[PDB]
């Protein structure tokens, strides 16, 4: 047994500074026995070995060509490129801002968006355009810094932190890190790791942070970092200091289709070991969205892209006959098997108590359907569905211009005193009870109103005044991106967002026809060819 | 180890209580025999940790100067004359119990108002001044003293509070201490630090203070405290006992513009790393506060000042074509995008059915957008906007001057007899608490009924009787402030409180048209785009 | 373990009684076992340190004195000399106690009155007057009884009472506890504490008040409970027992200046640490009392002056010319704001349709002047301000008066029949329940009706006799005390109230000149400048 000669040599050998000198020095301290075992020597020999292995002033150096990386920009994704600006303003930031303290506390541009979208992609994006080392190491799910920081050397089990898996990971003491779900941590048993994440944040006493394994603290100078997320609001407002919202927008069909045979399906040739032998068609790829995935991620997708991968390698392993293997919409269930979802959701043979509604959750979107049961009676209001109360004004506001607006849409005059309403609508009990789509309420109150067919593939989102009105409102964005998802091409939208309606990337506004709106009456032709 | 004997050095010549010396040297009778041995060993080494380095005995120079002071209190966001007053105020009272009296006991004088106001920079400049040590801790949503203090000397998992982990921070027994948030802090299980407030509020009862991590009485009588809040409704009164609150009002948008050209970019310019090569002009300044945030104060402007200075780091970054890049307003357009607004808003179409009220909470103030649907129905009153009665008072009562000439506004006779009226307010009761903005509810009662527009611009807010006389709000500044803030120059101000209008500084009312009213006919004649 | 024997020997070193101490070692042979790592341990710990951190019986020194309990009453706001006799009277109690310890089945004296003229500093006065601790406890808004009792220990985190840590806090059983804002119990969370403070309050259960965290049923024998309140009408039954109120009148202007000088303002000038710095003439005192807070209280006139001093210690601060400085008349408006009343508030340009009249708060008696609208409509009354039905009935003896005086005083045949009548009192349930202010509504409705020039500084309040006539009150005094610090100079009083005169001094009443009639055509005329 020769560990201790080994680990001397590790001491000398391993570039060390000089309280860490000292802390080695200890460590020999608790080695000079002869066994193994004995948690003394086991912790000191296994901190020797976590010493010995995070470098210790041992980096690489950076090309630090913006453009380049704006040429590394070009890759990793097909994209829309419009935050990869952002991602070149902080980085311009950096270009100027360098070894100097007169930048001090730089927020790093922490991720939020989609699942499943390439951000890891990104990050080895900017870790080869810098010529720097990306990891990942995820630290969300956290309640805790002993997971954070060290477990102790007094205890047995003495872990460091996941820090330090990541440093014992890395050679260089400029790399790229990749920080996961952090917008999902908690704290309810011993310590909150947010701090930790507080002082790592920190670019002075990062350099100082030190673990509950450790005995000198360890240098973050040189290491970036970089931060990912997925959802908004459930961010540390601590932890809001020194970062930078980067929000994801979600890919659509199109774009995620030239990412896949730009980027995936190769990969997925490879991944089944084919040069290309199946011959992937692109409708095909359409039907695969359409029938076997919902994300705006690329992950269902590259489940069944690697599904057809594995079948067709096997059918290869089976007999070869064809590098022209050309795959179409209708071998797909050969290969997917049973289809996941319907070809159409937009097709509900358009009825009365009917709603069709666009708004968006952090990681997907959703359609919002409304049940009007119009009994005869005496004229009631009724809020089912979890419904807030900015949906009931909402929806009463509504109700009251029909009240003003009767015979203007061949209604009777006394219809608020005569039938009763009840309102259902089940995603109401989706949290947001903004007022996001006060005039799809109208439209169903119209429809039940009528008794008559609320029109299919006519989505509608927004605000509304007693008058009638169309007020502005926002995430219009991701409202349109799902829309497309959606495949609706009938999109009423505000006449008074318009401002905001070529504020984005033309080829969504291409696929998706607007039908603007500032007026109420505008739509009340929409959904109803049947408004008597 | 010896490391623990350095720790029983660091404790024991640091000066202490006799009892400190006791429960460390029972710490070192609990680390004698839990070496490497159970939490015990953990917690007390840690315990001992935080004796040897929350600070003991030391010192730390005051304020001195009062009109240096006010030389510092004009080197703050800007100089604004109105609360370093109360500043000034304060340090006299204390420099004359200096002497340290039992005329010491005094409330600390909460910072109450709304953001965007530099909150932080206020104690940053008091701590230019008292050359006496800044520190901060977010008072956000406590619930606990187990947030404030400990609940275990012995198996470490319990910690000190944030305000002892604070006192670890320093070296000093006499910080500058700000304190944010008294307001948000949060009562809510059973176990909120309520007390405790008074605890740090109370000097003799902080001066011996603990925790139930570490249990010794703790100075902070020495310590100096002050805090700062937002609004006044949420403080428990107990709490508002022994204090007294600041109110702070708003900026004028050209004082942001000094703000801005004195200060901001200029430090947009330090943090860009671009000293001596960026110009922007000073109507582009005006331009971005007219179009582009709606905020009441500095925030989303300072964030505009940011994002544009790193917009000039990326387009200097895209090659030096001059030592001093410059820009105009013409180009913020390519440096914001659209225009989120227009500048003072003097074009929103007259509108007959709908006013436009004066608001301020101390966290902002608005316009509210009020409209009566007149649907005939029975004849009726309606409080829509889920609205408290005292909008029911205010509405009827107006409501009531108007039924007192149904001709002597170009109206028929009954309107209260035959058409149900639906009165709404954006908010769901009064933000000035109580009627405060009756004659707005009633100009669109008067819209409404005439279905004539109502003139924009002309704001109105303020009180009623029922023979049609303006009964005085006061704070009225801040009504003002919600105007300049909304850029409104058009002002329906009470004859009553002239007098009280006298009491500003003339930034605040550059050119106003103040139509000074004392009845209502005449703001009827001001505020419908015809008499009628 | 060292909590353990810390938790431990609390049973064995704190005086016990025999149940207490039985269940103290319950919870100790219930624990014992691993306590960090689990709650139910820790809100056992606490349970613990209720019961090991209460009281037993440890007291004040019993001195019942008359003589120089009333020299520390002669320390009294002016020297008011008339309820000390009270405070001996229950100090006969005191002396008369014998058949209990503490005697109830006796007035055990709430205070109703003006909050904060003294009132806790008359609790100040008996505590040194009875050589106690004394503590505050306050009522607003209380509803609850887990606020009074011990909370149920089945919900863990349960707590004692507000009272009970209270006692937890103050560790004799015969403090002075001032027993505030008792007059907001209601049964809206768990049950009416009114029935709690009862048994509180009950001579032979005090010694065993069930509490449901600590579920031993906790002693009173002789705690010195001293209550107060600003209501009497709506006390509920079992609280409206074993007491009577004994109210304070209001200081006059000398009165409260001589608070001032005696006492207040050399108050103010040690807490300036200006002592004797400062001197300010009396007339410019007068003037603050004038033109600066309207207040039945004198705290807020004490604030005035901590802004004067707090003024003038900056000044002598930023100049020292004299130690000892004048302030005159001039500088009030310089060293205060401008000054908010008119002294003179006689100025109003006596109306036509609207009468002002005395009325009574909690905090005692002022100034309102209720609005009548008459409006044409189908004849109807409308009593706003959210009045009481006594309101509407002594309206509607109004009502039948000027049915019976038609064309007496001249009016029109319809207030009743095509004419509605709308009528706003500024408050609504006042606490002088009944029409405490009828006849000054009745003189706004002939105001409106008869449509005759009211009149100015002329107070009136009572009842309106279905009779036609008018009927005394009591309660009108403290109103009268406003009228006087009003300034206000004619009354119409009903003629039983020339006795009522009696106990109130002739120097309010010079100025107050009173017509004291209780026909209902004299008070027609009395008020208005055209007596018809």
Redesign the interface.
Known sequence: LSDLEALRKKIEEVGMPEAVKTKALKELDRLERMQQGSP?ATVARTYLDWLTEVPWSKADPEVLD?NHTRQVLDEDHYGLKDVKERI???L??R????G?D??NKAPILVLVGPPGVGKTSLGRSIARSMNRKFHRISLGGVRDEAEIRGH????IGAMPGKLIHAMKQVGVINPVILLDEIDKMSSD???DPASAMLEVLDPEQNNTFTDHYLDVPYDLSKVFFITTANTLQTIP??LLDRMEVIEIPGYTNMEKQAIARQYLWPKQVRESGMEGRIEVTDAAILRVISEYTREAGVRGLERELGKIARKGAKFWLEGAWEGLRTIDASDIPTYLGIPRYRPDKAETEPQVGTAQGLAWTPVGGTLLTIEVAAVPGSGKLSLTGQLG?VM??SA??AL??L??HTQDYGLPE?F??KVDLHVHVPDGATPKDGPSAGITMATAIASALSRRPARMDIAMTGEV???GKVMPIGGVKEKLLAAHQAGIHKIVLPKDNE??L??LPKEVLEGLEIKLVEDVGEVLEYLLLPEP
Chains 1, 2, 3 share one sequence.
């Open positions: 003394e913006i070149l303003e902080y311009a930031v270009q100027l801002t360098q100097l007169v930048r102790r050397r007094t205890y048993w011993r310590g407002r601590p109360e009931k004004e009463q506001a009251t211009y009240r003003a006394d608020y005193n005044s007693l008058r401002a905001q070529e504020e």
